[PDB]
């Protein structure tokens, strides 16, 4: 029963690490992208 519960309950180190890595990459991207997105209307006005 202990083995069965462990298998049903525990999580996979590898899968979860991969997901964490992907999400971190996404976070970096999105942060930079938002910065630039704000910058873009700013240069629109600047050129105004």
């Amino acid at each position: 029963l202990t083995s069965a519960r462990s298998r049903i309950e525990d999580s996979d180190y590898a899968t979860e690490v991969s997901n964490m890595s992907r999400a971190q990459i996404l976070q970096q991207a999105g942060t930079s992208v938002l910065a630039q997105a704000n910058q873009v209307p700013q240069n629109v006005l600047s050129l105004l």
């Binding site: 990459i25 996404l26 991207a29 992208v33 630039q36 997105a37």
Partner: protein
Amino acid sequence: VINTNSLSLLTQNNLNKSQSALGTAIERLSSGLRINSAKDDAAGQAI
């Protein structure tokens, strides 16, 4: 001559299109995916 700035009307064409490419690239990077709506690739979306 005086009345109409056909040249400026022509220039206006160039900003949007490029901006549409800009937005496509921006959203692609933010999502992390090439295909973000079936418009871009229906077949890939389904697959």
